[PDB]
């Protein structure tokens, strides 16, 4: 707003969002975390990863929950374990869910994540 | 052409499209050159960015009465103020070696202007707490406590600004003191008629003086 250095142009921001490199896309991957999680980790939002556990709260399956299995930053979608959809050909696929429609419930830790939690701390 | 109009003389018979410019960036650059001088005044460190200029009379008979800011004080003005031109350029005094003081009034209007400006100098030390006496007719310098108590006061800019001139257009006279016998129009006509021969006499004065 008051920062004239950065633009508020519709086309500029849309181009930035739709041609963002994956490093910036992983930050748009961010989603809210539940109330208990927010109390514990003192923050409000975090990006997602292939072994987080999430609860979707918008869309045709706004009640389901589960461990997300894969995220792809090109389509801006995440996929949770048991929201599979049957295709016309007759074999199962995954329903893409926007990260903004879900709330985190749990997080996974690894050799990578044992310092992502430290930086987010 | 037709009807009762002024005969046109528009000078647009060349490729005038290339020579059109519109000043959209008027107030933008006004702001920019405001900020430039604000930055300059912040950077020089409390020394005013203006320079002192002489009060000078405008030439020709159209602007005879007016005065303005001239370029530079003359050598004899600076010397009567007790400054060499070289030592005056360094304390915000403009100098030009082209003007000559053609009048006592011209001299003794700028001399006390120079002295009034000189009555406001406050020098600074140079060598890390080694304040000294100076050189060249510039006033002296002060010490640590003075530099801690002087630099944070209000600067004076009216003296840099062109001297306000109050001229009494309106005035009165005793009626008994008027010269009722004068003939101004006759005096003017006589002067115009007699201009030629007085020029002749001046020429002959010069020829005689060349002896």
């Amino acid at each position: 707003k008051f920062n004239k250095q950065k633009s508020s142009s519709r086309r500029k921001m849309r181009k930035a969002h739709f041609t963002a490199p994956a490093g910036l896309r992983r930050k748009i991957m961010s989603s809210k975390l539940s109330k208990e999680l927010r109390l514990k980790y003192k923050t409000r939002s975090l990006p997602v990863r292939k072994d987080d556990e999430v609860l979707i709260c918008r869309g045709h399956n706004h009640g389901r929950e589960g461990k997300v299995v894969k995220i792809n930053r090109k389509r801006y979608k995440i996929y949770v374990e048991r929201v599979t959809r049957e295709k016309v050909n007759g074999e199962s696929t995954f329903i893409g869910i926007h990260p903004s429609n879900v709330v985190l419930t749990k997080l996974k830790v690894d050799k990578n994540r044992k310092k992502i939690l430290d930086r987010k701390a | 052409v037709a009807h009762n109009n002024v005969l046109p003389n528009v000078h647009l018979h060349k490729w005038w499209q290339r020579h059109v410019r519109v000043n959209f960036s008027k107030n933008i650059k006004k702001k920019k050159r405001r900020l430039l001088r604000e930055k300059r005044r912040k950077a020089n460190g409390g020394t005013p960015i203006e320079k002192l200029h002489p009060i000078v009379h405008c030439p020709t008979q159209r602007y005879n009465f007016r005065t303005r800011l001239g370029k530079g004080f003359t050598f004899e003005e600076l010397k009567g103020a007790g400054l060499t031109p070289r030592a005056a350029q360094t304390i915000g005094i403009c100098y030009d070696k082209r003007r000559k003081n053609r009048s006592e009034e011209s001299l003794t209007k700028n001399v006390e202007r120079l002295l009034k400006y000189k009555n406001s100098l406050v020098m600074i030390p140079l060598k890390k707490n080694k304040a000294k006496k100076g050189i060249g007719g510039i006033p002296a310098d002060a010490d640590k406590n003075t530099i801690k108590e002087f630099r944070n006061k209000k600067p004076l800019l009216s003296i840099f600004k062109k001297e306000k001139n109050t001229k009494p257009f309106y005035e009165t006279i005793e009626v008994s003191k008027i010269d009722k016998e004068f003939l101004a129009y006759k005096t003017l006509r006589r002067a115009k008629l007699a201009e030629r021969r007085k020029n002749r006499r001046q020429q002959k004065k010069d020829i005689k003086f060349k002896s």
Binding site: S8, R10, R11 | V22
Partner: protein, 154 residues
């Protein structure tokens, strides 16, 4: 303004008597179906507008300073009439007196929660209600030109 020579960046070929076609300039050459098409012209496809817009249009106006201060004084005076401010669109049926003056402690506080609280307690709950729901997307091509919303004036 449009580009200076927009639509005129080609070759003027108007071989137009005996060809059984209109005398409009044609694009020369072949191989393209651009070749032989009507060249620059007010009527031709990709030909250039009739009077190309120029940046030296009289964009601004010089208004008399005295007229400007007359207008400002007049608007100030008009703001002091209950009927006029009611007619402009403000919901002021519940506030007490139209030349509304408040104490100087309005400046000393800097939370919009109590700003809105003061506005409501002063009798302008309906005015702020009008303002908050006046917000919506405008119609037309303006909203793809960084002009999305249209909000009422409070």
């Amino acid at each position: 303004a449009v580009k200076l020579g927009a639509g005129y960046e080609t070759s003027a070929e108007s071989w137009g008597t005996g060809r059984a076609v209109a005398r409009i300039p044609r694009v020369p050459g072949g191989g393209t179906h651009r070749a032989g098409q009507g060249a620059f012209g007010n009527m031709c496809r990709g030909g250039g507008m009739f009077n190309p817009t120029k940046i030296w249009r009289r964009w601004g106006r010089k208004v008399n300073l005295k007229e400007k201060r007359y207008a400002v004084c007049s608007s100030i005076a008009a703001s002091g009439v209950t009927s006029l401010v009611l007619a402009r669109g403000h919901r002021i049926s519940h506030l007490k007196e139209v030349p509304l003056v408040v104490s100087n402690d309005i400046e000393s506080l800097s939370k919009t929660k109590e700003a809105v609280n003061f506005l409501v307690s002063l009798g302008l709950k309906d005015e702020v209600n009008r303002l908050v729901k006046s917000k919506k997307i405008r119609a037309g091509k303006g909203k793809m030109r960084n002009r999305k919303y249209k909000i009422r004036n409070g």
